[PDB]
Structure formats: structure tokens, C-alpha cells
Amino acid sequence: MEVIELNKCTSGQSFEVILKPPSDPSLEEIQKKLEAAEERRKYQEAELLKHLAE
Amino acid sequence: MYTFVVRDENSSVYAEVSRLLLATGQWKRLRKDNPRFNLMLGERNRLPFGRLGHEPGLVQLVNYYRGADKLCRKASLVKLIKTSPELSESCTWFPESYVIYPTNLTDEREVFLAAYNRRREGREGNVWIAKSSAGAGILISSEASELLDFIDEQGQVHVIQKYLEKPLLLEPGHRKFDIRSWVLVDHLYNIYLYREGVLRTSSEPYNSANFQDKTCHLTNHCIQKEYSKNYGRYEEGNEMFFEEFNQYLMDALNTTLENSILLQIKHIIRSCLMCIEPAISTKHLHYQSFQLFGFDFMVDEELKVWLIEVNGAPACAQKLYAELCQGIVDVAISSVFPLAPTSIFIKLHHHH
Amino acid sequence: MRECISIHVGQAGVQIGNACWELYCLEHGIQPDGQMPSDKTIGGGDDSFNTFFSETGAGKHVPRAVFVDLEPTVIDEVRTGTYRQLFHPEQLITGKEDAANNYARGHYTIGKEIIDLVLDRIRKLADQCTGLQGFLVFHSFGGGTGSGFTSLLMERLSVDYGKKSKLEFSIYPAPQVSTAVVEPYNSILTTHTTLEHSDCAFMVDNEAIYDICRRNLDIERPTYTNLNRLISQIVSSITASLRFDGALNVDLTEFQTNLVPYPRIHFPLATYAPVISAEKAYHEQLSVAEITNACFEPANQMVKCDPRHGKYMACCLLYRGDVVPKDVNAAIATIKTKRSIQFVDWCPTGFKVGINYQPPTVVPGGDLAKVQRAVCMLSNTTAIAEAWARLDHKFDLMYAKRAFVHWYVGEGMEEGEFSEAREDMAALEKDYEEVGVD
Amino acid sequence: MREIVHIQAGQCGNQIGAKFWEVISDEHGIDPTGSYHGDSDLQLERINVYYNEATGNKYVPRAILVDLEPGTMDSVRSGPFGQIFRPDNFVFGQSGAGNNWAKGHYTEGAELVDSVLDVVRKESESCDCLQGFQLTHSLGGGTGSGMGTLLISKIREEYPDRIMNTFSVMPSPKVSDTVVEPYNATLSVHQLVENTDETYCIDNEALYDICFRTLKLTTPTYGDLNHLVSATMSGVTTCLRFPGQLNADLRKLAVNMVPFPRLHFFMPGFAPLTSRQQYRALTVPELTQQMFDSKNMMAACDPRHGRYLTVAAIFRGRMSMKEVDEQMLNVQNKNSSYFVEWIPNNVKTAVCDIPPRGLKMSATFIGNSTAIQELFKRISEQFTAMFRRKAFLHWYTGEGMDEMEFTEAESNMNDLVSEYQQYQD
Ligand SMILES: Nc1nc2c(ncn2[C@@H]2O[C@H](COP(=O)(O)OP(=O)(O)OP(=O)(O)O)[C@@H](O)[C@H]2O)c(=O)[nH]1
Ligand SMILES: Nc1ncnc2c1ncn2[C@@H]1O[C@H](COP(=O)(O)OP(=O)(O)CP(=O)(O)O)[C@@H](O)[C@H]1O
Ligand SMILES: Nc1nc2c(ncn2[C@@H]2O[C@H](COP(=O)(O)OP(=O)(O)O)[C@@H](O)[C@H]2O)c(=O)[nH]1
Ligand SMILES: CC(=O)N1c2ccccc2CC[C@@H]1C
Ligand SMILES: [Ca+2]
Ligand SMILES: [Ca+2]
Ligand SMILES: [Ca+2]
Ligand SMILES: [Mg+2]
Ligand SMILES: [Mg+2]
Ligand SMILES: [Mg+2]
């Protein structure tokens, strides 16, 4: 039951107690993810329009 | 109209509870995966406790205490008794035990040999028994070499504890036996002890000069019915009930079952359950738990009671299924989900 | 002095942000018009509160925040509310049609069209920082914006601000205060794409806040206002170190160092007490031991779960009020002899403790009463995995039937991003079980 | 600003739509000439969802009245609130549809469709942000059914990313104008399966049986049936017309109610439903036992014959919202055998403080149940009974249709029933 690193200032204090010792994607790759799904939306919408034209 | 689900088809006990719940015309069973239930009869292993108590408007009860395995595992129990100051290593009613890991994997090998070498030097009876939770697989021998060598031949955790070389023997017969008591614990954590217990006796005369044959030393119900040739001679199904066993104690030793053995059993049940109360209590939890327990005791010729193990998913005696199960609904289920005596239990009062 | 920029995303984030800056202002003595009398350095200064506020030549203290919502209705309350004079209009960004509780819509469809705009407004707050520490991102799991657009923002923030730390305040979905059925899907989607981009995240389970309001505050049917005024108290205690003089958790880096030895397992469990209803005539003021002891009760946890069946990896105690070190250790001893605290064998069994002498501030006419001392305990327990386990299960029940999947594919997301996300939670659950159970 | 564009087509379409605007116009305090005279600001909070704002603080419904004959729309323009509608929004022809789907969809309707869309375009162009559309109409006739579905197929072509909602009256032989209603209905169903996000199915037999049995009317009239649909239409559109923590959006409600693109046919319900013992106040439990009772549902399908995919209940009035929650949970937890277990928390509740005209409180039910298959089963049965003998086909083949198209409409609906069946097990 030890207490260490006791810091005291005007608005409070902090310390440490020890009971027992121990034992990314780039800007280019995100723009492609976004535009890839924007394409699968354009394809699906195109197939809907084609269906409506038929 | 309460609802419940079933997740353990191999539970002989709660199979009757489900039958009585439906017989009351006030409970309704659901599919084993529907999460809208009041009561769960959960599976033995890997019960998803984390998923209970999160359905708005439903008070949920389950028939297993999360953490009870600390008390129903051969290894965990030993570690619990030695490490918990409520029991201490000096616990008087639990045989001197040690947790031994196979050499193909803490471990108390060296500590065990010390107490073993001390006994061999003191001319004391030095017979030990090895067992594990993964057994149907037990070995009783007087040599430490055979015990340790037998554990290394397996691949799971084992425990070696002092074999009680002076077990109380019933007469006529000169045979061993163990006592099984059923104890119920409800959501409030009241400890009810079923007034009816059983003694699973051995039909073979005890023989302390031949631990090779393990039919007169093991009082289990499956070993006496498969490897014993005097099955059912003295009592039906190698099961003597507290009414007959009480008379025997009166006719022979001039004493009652209550005084000679029951008091110690009631103290062992209390001590074990009070110990782990702060760790498994559902008092301030989002759901409620209750679990049936089957303690297995040994009785020596000094009329001292020893704790063998605690079964977390025990089976009942054929004659006591009705009375007990009906009582499970009375004190455990309906006590939370009431319906529209002379209790069959002995309440073991304690401080929470 | 090092600044911290807060980002509020979606209805949940925006409203919760509304209740945090209201509280910050009541704490730091800032008025609704942005004026601060105690601040003697007019239009300048590197004080502790300056980590969250900037200053103009006219003495205005302006929060370092950015509100973002794909729908104007929720942020519009901010522009006309009581604190309309704190933010200039650029800090409040709004679309015209929300994400309809659809992660795909918030991340891909609508997110793409507004991401560059958000980053630019943030780039403006960043240019004012002499040493930006990182970001605090408030948002919900269930919302389509709070889940879909947050992960997209997190991805970009890790690209435009590589070395900066990112903390989340995430709202876990609870059926008692939600009319959305697909929130499990969004939660798992966002946790998968955000994981690698968040250094530490504080989950708040709405089910836990709901019950804390019903049990302690006697609010039969609580509103978001009740839930948010309470959530902001926890947020205030968790950020106090950054806004006040002190030594513990002095910058965002210290949250990972003190609470996250394993990066993926960056979800600490918050606990708070006491929560006392202001409708009570007067209450017996709790001591340090009683309020600390309460930190080990399930009823006071931001996420319902059983910590008795896990293993702690780290632990902080943040006290506010009449608290001295002697009383803290006193209660700690008393508790290490009654409770069930199982630490992991590769981490010390120690507690870092911080104390701020200013007691918790309460909103006038609020639901919380004024107390003289209170504590907030941040503990990284494997027990919080129960949260993931519940959510993951609900995900599996619907995905087995592909229910509601079409609403996501129709916005440009491939069906594989589901099982991939789910296989990442199965991995996350495994790491918790490899660290906790024997 | 999330505006909706209302469209009502055909005789049934316009008469039902008429009373709809008569009902909500009264709830939002709009008089027959379009002047606001309410007393609560809640009436105007979301008023622009169904009303445009003209000069002099005048509110003009965002509605488009369509029919192939002038008869019905003449009556609306001279009805109670007839003057309130935009004069230009009356688009009609003189040929009539002869209760023929082919005429509404291919010949007569085709000649008039482009002009209707010209008006829709004018209304959308003025919408700040258009939520989507909603169309009232029947499926047994020729205009609302034949030209109605034609309108949707063209509105979806021009606004493919807007929500398409409809209130569709289904034909029953017990309330039949002509024997070809099964033909017209089967043809319309296939269109709605493809080009609508939500369809409130209303069975004229349920409406009748509610009027004869529950309301105790010795002789019901189409007017009587329409009052119900009025109140039911007002009920389901409360989330959209009044403020609340719900944040109701047509696309949000669709995302939360439609787990599969083709199973978007809902059973609506209303409560109370009292005969004239009419001033008795209704407790919260009573609203809920009735709201889930089949006799208060208008699809003529016994929910106990299927399972609920999702349920959305709305409560109106100054009641204990705590008591509301407890009662909904009671109904769920007492019959969890009718809610699929593979969609967690598939029942949602919304509250609204403004009750309908002349009621302290009320509840509206919107269920996405598989028992709706019984509806399409009846139609498919009535259909084949005639199509197997090619009976009455000449009315249609004369308008250019082939028998092949009929056999397709048949299979398309039998598939729709099979789809509703696999999710019930
Ligand atoms: N604690 C708390 N939770 C909230 C609040 N607002 C919404 N939520 C929760 O957030 C979840 C829904 O997410 P929202 O924040 O509404 O979604 P969103 O970010 O606006 O995204 P959209 O779908 O586009 O509207 C629900 O589970 C709500 O309970 C709030 O103010 N406080
Ligand atoms: N230390 C010891 N001294 C004396 N007998 C012992 C003993 N350890 C075990 N036994 C014998 O073994 C039997 C109990 O075995 P144990 O309970 O460990 O295995 P098990 O758990 O598979 C049987 P069950 O759980 O069904 O009661 C008792 O009948 C007892 O006679
Ligand atoms: N509820 C209701 N149903 C109607 C009404 N008028 C017609 N119907 C039903 O609609 C079907 C006939 O459709 P109709 O309105 O004539 O279509 P139209 O050709 O577009 O005019 C029949 O099944 C009628 O039962 C009405 O006023 N109310
Ligand atoms: C003509 C009419 O009003 N209806 C109708 C229409 C067609 C067939 C029967 C009926 C009976 C009453 C019902 C309300
Ligand atoms: Ca200053
Ligand atoms: Ca990073
Ligand atoms: Ca013509
Ligand atoms: Mg056993
Ligand atoms: Mg929103
Ligand atoms: Mg007609």
C-alpha cells in the first residue's frame, strides 16, 4: 500500500497508489472507397431506369 | 401468464419443473432462442449471462449463479478454500488437498511431496486419491510415484487429496458410503436445505489392503451398479434415506443424525455459501439467480464430516423428485412470479 | 497550453454537446453572451480553460467546437437557444435530409458530399491552435449520421491530423429510448471502421442512463434533457483535468497511456456517484468511502454489466469536491477487503487518483442536486465485453435473414462489409476473452 | 422543411382524399377558405409538410386531384372544403375509365398522364426538400388503379430517390361495384410490389364489417367507410404533422418498417371505435386491447393467422406516457408467439399530445404482418376463378392487352404470397 507521485496545486492534487507489483488508409484510398460505392449506386439506378424504359 | 424457455434438455431435475409449471395453467414455454422470457432453464456450460436483464419491462430469473463454478470445480474449489480467509488453509472439514497440473502444460507439486514425505516418515497412513472434473477416472494408491505418474498420463487439471483411510462403515456389511444433501439458494440468497438427504452406499465390504480394486472405495451410483456384484442387497438402489439412517445411528451408536452429522453438514453448507456471497449475489443486479446444489460429504469413524465436492448440476434421488421439485417452485420461482406447509426445507439463517 | 477541439455528430452528439458546453460555461463562469469576468487576460491568455475556449478582442470566450448534422432541425435549436451567442455560425453545419438511420447513407451517399466541408471548418479551428492535442468526438451508435458519418470523419482525421489523438463519447443503443430497429447494424458497422482510428472511447449505455434517472431521480418517463444533463456530468468529470489546473490526465495522450495498454481494447467503463435527486428536501451527505464504495455497484455504471467477472487492465479515480488523499486510501483499503477485484497478471494492481477541489456544478432548475464531493471511476474491465456480446447477438439474429440489408446495399455498400464488420467484432470479443478468462 | 406531395386518383381516391384533407385541415386549424384559426403553435410547427403557404397567411394543401371523368372532382370542388384546393391542381378528362385497369394504364390514362406530372413537377420545384409522395386510390376500379399505378411508375422515373407512399383500398366481393375488381386489383398489386416503399392496405370488407358489427349501422354507405379511412389516414400521418422527439421521416419510417423490399404492405388499425355509450372515457389498457384486436384492423386479416414483422403504434392525447409503455410491453410479452423472434424490439411507440377532433385520446396501429398474405390469397383466388375461363377478358384485350400479361400478374402475386409464407415459419 504505497503512495507515489503526489502533485499538489491550488485546485487539487493527484497521486498514484500501488497495491501489488505486476507479474491506415491514405487520402487516395478513401476517395476510392467513396467513389466505388457511388458507382454501384449509378449502376443500380441505371438498371432501374433501363427497367422503366422497357 | 409467465413465460420460460428451456436450454438444457438433459436436466432431469428441471424437466419436472417444466412439467409442473405447465400443470398450473399459469406458465407458458417458449422456443429455446426467444429472448422474451421471465425464467430461463439455462445450459450447463457457457450460459450467456451477459444477455440477461436487458428486456424492458421483464423481470428475468435464471437457474444458475454466475461464478458458482468456483465452488463446483475440483480445482477451483481447492483454490477457493486455501485462498479465501473465510475458510483458510486450516479449514477443518475439507481434506488436505493439492492442485496438480500435468507436466505437459499455480501448481502445488512440491508442496504435496512435502506433506507426503512427512507422513511416510511419521508412520502415518499415507494413502492418497487422485481425481479430476473430466472423469466419468480415479486412482487410489499409497505410492506418490503412481499418483503423479497417473496424472501425467492425462491432459487436464487434477487434484490429489488425502484418502480418508478410516471411513465409517455401516453394519451389517462393513461398507463405505457418502452423503448427498440438496441445498437451494433463492434470489434473496436464503439458504434452504432439503430436509431429505440420501446415502449412496457401497454394497462391497471395505478393504484397506487393496486399493487396486476400486469398487468398495468409490460410492458413486454408476460404479456400484456396473462393477459391484452385491448391488441392492442391503438397501434398494444403494440409497439409504435419513429416516432409516437415523434409526441405525440410534440402534448402534446411541445418537441422532441431527446431532452427529447434520449439524456439521449445515455448517459446511453455510460456510461455503457465505464465502462466495459477495461475488455471486444478484441483490443489486439487473437480473436474478437461483441454483440447486448437491453437496457430497464423507463420514469417518470418529463421526467427523468431510466435504468431498459440490455438484453444480446434480441429479436427485428418484424418490425425492416430486417433493423437492414442487418446493423449488414454491420458494424459488413463485416467490418472484406468484401464482393466483410445513416447508420441506431447513432455512440456514446467516448475515448477508 | 494545448487546445482540444470537440466534434459533435448527429442528434445525440449535438444535444449532448449542448448539455456539456452549458455545463462548462456554468463551471468556468462563462455567461451566455461569451463574456467571462474572472478572465483578466482580455482577448488572450493560455489558461487551463483555454484548452476548450478561444478569445476575441471583445472579450468573448468561444468554444473550440464543431456541430455537424445531416438535418437542420436539431442544430437549429442551438442557433436560437440560450447559448446562441457562444458559437459563430460557421461552427454549426447542417444538411437538408438526414441519413434515415442508415449507416450507408451517412458514410457513403450523403457523407461524401459534405466531408470536405466539415474538414475545412475544422481546419479553421485548428489554425487557431498553437499546439492541438487531439479531438473529442461525441456521437451515437444507432443514428445513421452518428454511425455512418463519424467513421468517415474519423478516417479523414487520421489522414489530415496523423499524430493527434482522438477520443470518442459513443451512445450505446437502448430500446427504451429508440424508435429505430436497425441500430445494431449501424453500431457494428461504425465500430469496425472506427476502431483503428480511435485511441480511447467512452461508451454510455442509454439503458444505464435511463435507469439511473428512474431510480435515483424518480423520473417516471425521462426525456433526452434528463439523460443529457446527466451524461454531461460524467463528461465534465472526464474532461475536468484538461480544463483545470492539475497533474493527472493533463492532455489527451494521458488517456491512452493510463487506460489502454492494448490498442483495440480501448473501451473503458465509466462509473459515477452520487446521483441525488434535487426534489429531495435534504440528503445525508455521503463521505469519501461511501461514494467510492458506490463505484463498485452495477447501478452506477454507464454500461450495465458485472465487473466482478472480468479482469481490470487499468483504473483511474477522479474526485471533485471536499476530498483529501488520506480519505481516498482509507476507503480503498476498506474496499480491497470486501469486493471482487481481479487484475490481469501483466498490469500493476494500482489506482491513479486525481482530485479537483471545485465540487460538481449543477444546472439551475436541473434534475441533479448539489453535492459536496463526487467521484468518477474509469476502469478498463473485460466485463464490458458483455455489451459487445449483447449487440453482436442482435446483429446475428437479423443478418441470418438478411433483414433490412437492402436499405444498405441500395446506398452503395456491398453486402460483404457486413460479415467483415461482424468478423471484426468476433475478433474483438475474442481478445477480451483471451485477456480475462483463465 | 420536409414537404410531402399528395396525389388522389379516381372516384374512391378523391372521395377518401377529400375527407382526409377535411380531417387534418380541422386539426391544423385551417378553415374551408385556407385561413388559420387555431389556438396552439403546435398546429403550425410542421404545417408545411402537407400545406403550401400563399399570400395573406393562406395555407393551400399540396394536393393534386386526378380522375378520368369530371363527376367526382366536380363534387369535391363543391364539397365542404372544396374551395381550399388549388384550382390548377384539378387535372381530369372526360372519357372515364369504365372501371377498366387497361384504360387507366394504357389508353385513356396515357393520354392524360403527362399533364398530371406537369403539375407534380410544379409542386416539387417549390419544395425546399421533398420527402416523397403519397397516393390515395382504390385498386378495383380503372382510374385510381390503372392510371394510379401508371403515375407511380412515372413519378419513380423522375424522382427515383424519393419515398412513394400509398393508401390502397382493396376490393371485396361483398362490397363490389363490378366483377372485374379482381382483375384490376391483381394488376395493380404487381406495380406496387415494385414501385412503392409503403402501402397501407385497406379492405372495404373490413371497413364494412366494422361499420355493421362494431359501429352498429344498419346500412353503411361509402361515406361511412370513408370516415374511417379519414381518421386512419390522420392517425398514421401524426408522426409527420406534429412535433415530437420521434423525428419522423418517410425514409426513416420505411427503413424501420420494411425489412425486405417487397414486403411493404401494412395493416392499419384505429381505436377507439364506439357506437352511439360514446362519451365514456377510455383508459390506456382499453386503447391497447382494441388496437391489437383484429376487429379494429382494416385489412380483413386475422393477425393470429400470421406473424408481425414490425409494429408501429402512435398514441394521441394527454395520457400517462409511462402507462403507455407498460401497456405496450404487456401486449408484446403476452403474445410473443405472433412477433418474429429474429428482429429484436420490432414494436415501437410514439406519443403525441394533440388528440383527434372529438376525442380525449386515441391510438393508431400500423402493422407489417405476414397475415396480409390472406389478403392477396383472396384476390388471387377470385382472379383465377375467372381467368381460367377467360371470362371478361375481352374488355382488356380490346384495349391492347395480351393474355400473357395476365398470366404474369398472376404469377407475380402467387410469388408474393410464397414470399410472405417462408417468413411466417
Ligand atoms: N443519450 C442520448 N441519446 C440520444 C439523444 N438523441 C438521440 N439519441 C439516441 O441516438 C440513437 C439514434 O441516433 P440519432 O442521434 O438520433 O441519429 P442521427 O445522428 O441524427 O442520424 P440520422 O439517422 O441521420 O438522424 C437512439 O438510440 C437514441 O436513443 C440524446 O440527446 N441523448
Ligand atoms: N479423499 C477422499 N477420501 C475418501 N473417499 C473419497 C475421497 N475422494 C473421493 N472419494 C470417493 O469418491 C466418491 C466421490 O468422487 P467425486 O465426487 O470426486 O467424483 P464425481 O464428482 O465424478 C462423483 P459425483 O459428482 O456424482 O458425486 C465418493 O463416494 C468417495 O467415497
Ligand atoms: N372506401 C371506399 N371505397 C370505394 C369508394 N368508391 C369506390 N370504392 C371502391 O373502389 C372500387 C372501385 O374503384 P373506383 O373508385 O370506381 O375507381 P376509379 O375508376 O378510379 O373511379 C370498388 O371496389 C369500390 O368498392 C369510396 O368512396 N370509399
Ligand atoms: C353503395 C354503397 O354505399 N356500398 C356498397 C357498394 C357496392 C356493393 C354493396 C354496397 C353496400 C354498402 C356500401 C357502403
Ligand atoms: Ca484569458
Ligand atoms: Ca491514428
Ligand atoms: Ca382520346
Ligand atoms: Mg463431478
Ligand atoms: Mg437525425
Ligand atoms: Mg366508380
Coordinates of C-alpha atoms and ligand atoms in Angstrom, one line a residue, chain D residues 174-177 208 220-222 225, ligand 4:
Chain D
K174 CA -69.1 -8.2 -50.5
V175 CA -68.5 -4.6 -51.4
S176 CA -68.2 -4.8 -55.2
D177 CA -69.0 -2.4 -57.9
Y208 CA -68.0 -2.5 -43.8
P220 CA -73.5 1.6 -44.2
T221 CA -72.5 3.9 -47.1
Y222 CA -69.3 4.6 -48.9
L225 CA -66.4 3.8 -44.8
Ligands
LIG4 C1 -73.2 1.6 -52.4 C2 -72.5 1.6 -51.0 O1 -72.6 2.6 -50.3 N1 -71.9 0.4 -50.6 C3 -71.9 -0.8 -51.5 C4 -71.2 -0.7 -52.7 C5 -71.2 -1.9 -53.5 C6 -71.9 -3.0 -53.1 C7 -72.5 -3.0 -51.9 C8 -72.5 -1.9 -51.1 C9 -73.2 -1.9 -49.7 C10 -73.0 -0.7 -48.8 C11 -71.7 0.0 -49.2 C12 -71.4 1.2 -48.3

